[PDB]
Ligand binder design. Structure first.
Ligand SMILES: *[C@@H]1O[C@H](CO)[C@@H](O)[C@H](O)[C@H]1NC(C)=O
Ligand SMILES: *[C@@H]1O[C@H](CO)[C@@H](O)[C@H](O)[C@H]1NC(C)=O
Lengths: 102, 109, 102, 109
């Protein structure tokens, strides 16, 4: 486990019908603990999650406690098949590149 | 001057192909004689796409991958079926990790 | 409960030493279920969380399953006390204004 | 032309105050005679800040709130202690939700 950080995660696109390339790729995923004070090499917490963690530290059961989620994404050049024609197009938000607590 | 430090691939895109993968590398001067070669910017992996019909096989796309993903460690091109656009056509794709490895494959039984 | 949506949440700034105004304010928080397909009035899912949910629907235990988190924030004009001088300054990321699944 | 549809507050900021809340409303023409009034853009809530010393009380800030938060439903200004900058000074703040309600308070025992 550990603090909130970026972890490798393979995603399979052979399930997707039209995708030719890639077939599997590294999409990654954010995972870890959102401690207070923070101990992670991610950018500093936003004020909102800071106030959430400080409410929780004073004994407040948050309905949705802070979560380790991606804060930045990168695209991928997907080669897919539309009708019977091959299309190489950029698809955004395919890879998680940065993590944070929110 | 010196040997290429980056991966070089066969580059080809049939007229029926929409879009391009040329942004994934830099086209080399091949002596202005076919086929083109491309030096990859973001990976050490070449890819190849073939359209397999009744009795023939047409190359559709050849070029660079945008990243090193599982399957790229292959030294040679071993295509596997990826699409069935029509009952008489099957699209096979291969990825490999050596120079010009996407040129062709051994055989598709 | 329900789907991923924005819920009211009061935050107390009287715990913070220097803050004069506000003392309590609506910071809100994102809470709900990240179903697949989505059924919420939030913007459409990003491709990354879509692929996560489709992995999970095929029977894959995600180490960090999709989370309902804020995707947009708004600031607040805080009146605080630095040294013995009063300062009115804008502080960003004080209010969650939009939700999403990541 | 017609009565104001938005909340109006007393506006004042002592010289020692850094920053301003004037961006939270629009200053009205008060006859160029003291004190200023401000019509709020984002709330129906006025606020007041007082510095309470040994025997006297100085108004430090008066103006608009940036949103309607708990405590704004008060019809009049009832200040409560918020800061202790020095052993001889206490900063009291009040918020209320009627026109010019931040002008002054009844008493602070
Ligand atoms: C595959 O080849 C057939 C026969 O030439 C053609 O009709 C079909 O459009 C081709 N498919 C692709 C995806 O290029
Ligand atoms: C409060 O008044 C005292 C006495 O005039 C002054 O020294 C002090 O700086 C004031 N505090 C603030 C926050 O203005």
């Amino acid at each position: 486990d550990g603090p909130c950080a970026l972890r490798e995660l393979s995603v399979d696109l052979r399930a997707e019908r039209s995708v030719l390339i890639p077939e599997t790729y590294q999409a990654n995923n954010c995972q870890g603990v959102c401690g207070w004070p923070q101990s992670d090499r991610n950018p500093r917490y936003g004020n909102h999650v800071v106030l959430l963690l400080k409410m929780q530290a004073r004994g407040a059961a948050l309905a949705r406690p802070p979560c380790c989620v991606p804060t930045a994404y990168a695209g991928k050049l997907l080669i897919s098949l539309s009708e019977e024609r091959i299309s190489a197009h950029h698809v955004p938000n395919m890879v998680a590149t940065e993590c944070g607590c929110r | 001057h010196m040997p290429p430090n980056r991966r070089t691939c066969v580059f080809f895109e049939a007229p029926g192909v929409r879009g391009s993968t040329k942004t994934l590398g830099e086209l080399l001067d091949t002596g202005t004689e076919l086929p083109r070669a491309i030096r990859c910017l973001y990976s050490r992996c070449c890819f190849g796409i073939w359209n397999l019909t009744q009795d023939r096989a047409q190359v559709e796309m050849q070029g660079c991958r945008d990243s090193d993903e599982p399957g790229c460690e292959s030294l040679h091109c071993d295509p596997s079926p990826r699409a069935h656009p029509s009952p008489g056509s099957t699209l096979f794709t291969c990825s490999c990790g050596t120079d010009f490895c996407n040129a062709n494959y051994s055989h598709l039984p």
